[PDB]
């Protein structure tokens, strides 16, 4: 016998292989795995890792936020491993060249009409193998409603977690333990 942590087997955490059976996504994963292995760049390694991430970790990126992120380099390539969505709050958009998995068709039309162009990851690999002049971005990973119920339980002091309730009215989990008048608050 020997005294080792977990009998001496290194344990890794997270995704190991792509779960999706989308053949185009499998081809993309193979291409970028090869690129990351052969080319030394961390750019391709990051893209290969992000391509196999779950849906909740490929969050959408709005046109307005994408333009804001790309404001300080107008001639570079904005690459995201999520999907690009349109922002109606944005009055005008200009000259953005964006590589992404998906473009909502309204956002695609807006990008083309603004003079820019939309690229897929095969195009990005073909004409930017090492990610030169490419800035990779990602949308808000934990802005979705699920994380609003995570963290400290609602009922712990200073807890911002949303409870799971049928309705959000006056009669639904608002009386005791949520206001000082009825026993305690929070």
């Amino acid at each position: 016998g020997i005294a080792l942590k977990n009998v001496g087997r290194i344990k890794k955490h997270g995704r190991k292989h792509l779960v999706s059976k989308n053949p185009y996504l499998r081809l993309l994963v193979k291409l970028y795995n090869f690129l990351a292995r052969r080319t030394n760049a961390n750019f391709n390694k990051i893209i290969a890792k992000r391509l196999i991430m779950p849906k909740r970790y490929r969050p959408p990126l709005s046109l307005s936020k994408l333009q804001y992120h790309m404001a300080n380099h107008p001639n570079d390539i904005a690459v995201v491993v999520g999907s690009i969505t349109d922002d109606k709050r944005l009055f005008s958009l200009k000259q953005l060249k964006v590589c992404a998995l998906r473009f909502t068709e309204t956002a695609r039309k807006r990008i083309e009409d603004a003079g820019g162009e939309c690229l897929t990851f095969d195009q990005l690999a073909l004409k930017y193998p090492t990610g030169k002049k490419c800035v990779l971005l990602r949308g808000p990973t934990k802005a979705r409603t699920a994380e609003k119920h995570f963290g400290k339980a609602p009922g712990k002091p200073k807890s911002k977690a949303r409870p799971y309730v049928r309705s959000k009215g006056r009669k639904f989990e608002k009386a005791r333990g949520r206001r000082k008048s009825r026993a305690y608050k929070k």
Binding site: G1, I2, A3, L4, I10
Partner: protein, 223 residues
């Protein structure tokens, strides 16, 4: 591309003669050290003005007990001494911190002064090395100087010749030699122990404790 093969060919002779001069200096240093220690010892004899060595600055420790029924801090000291199996051996640099931490596992180990022939034997016939990248080491017997140079050559300790000369005399690099070495996996003693239960210093036969110079016979009997 034809220039590449010849420029990688000439560098082999360049480094060969570099280490050839370096080993001439090495052997001169070694014989000078041998002459200095004996001459100081001899000068100690004419008049009542003595000479000695201190603690040898390096000790070899062999674990004696298994993995079951051990106190938590004994287990922790074993872990950070890299002494995990019932017959593992490691070199430990001797100072106040290591000596105090070794005193707590004293009844479960036996340790002593290695001496040059024994450390050379340990490295030559039981020496295995951690080759892989950080935390991915993949234990490998030495069998060559290439990996020693790859991990330590940029730190000018390339070679088992250089590396025994660093383990025996506790030189400026132990962090990169002792840590580089995999823990020695030793056989049971050829003629057996006396009693793992009892101390080497008890009048009754026993094994654990500081054997000092008496660990060389145990090592080459377990080797």
């Amino acid at each position: 591309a034809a220039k590449k093969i010849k420029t990688l060919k000439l560098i082999n002779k360049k480094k060969r003669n570099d280490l050839r001069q370096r080993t001439l200096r090495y052997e001169e240093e070694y014989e000078s050290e041998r002459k200095k220690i004996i001459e100081l010892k001899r000068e100690a004899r004419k008049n009542n003005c003595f000479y000695r060595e201190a603690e040898k600055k390096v000790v070899f420790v062999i674990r004696l007990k298994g993995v079951n029924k051990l106190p938590p801090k004994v287990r922790s000291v074993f872990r950070l001494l890299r002494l995990l199996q019932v017959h593992n051996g490691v070199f430990v640099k001797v100072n106040k911190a290591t000596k105090e931490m070794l005193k707590i596992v004293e009844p479960y180990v036996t340790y002593g002064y290695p001496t040059l022939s024994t450390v050379r034997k340990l490295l030559y016939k039981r020496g295995y090395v951690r080759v892989g990248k950080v935390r991915r080491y993949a234990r490998k017997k030495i069998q060559d100087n290439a990996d020693i140079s790859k991990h330590l050559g940029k730190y000018n300790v390339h070679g088992i010749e250089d590396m025994v000369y660093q383990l025996y005399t506790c030189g400026p690099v132990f962090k990169k030699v002792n840590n580089f070495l995999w823990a020695f996996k030793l056989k049971p003693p050829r003629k057996g122990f006396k009693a793992k239960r009892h101390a080497f210093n008890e009048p009754r036969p026993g094994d654990w404790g500081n054997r000092e110079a008496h660990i060389n016979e145990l090592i080459n009997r377990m080797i």
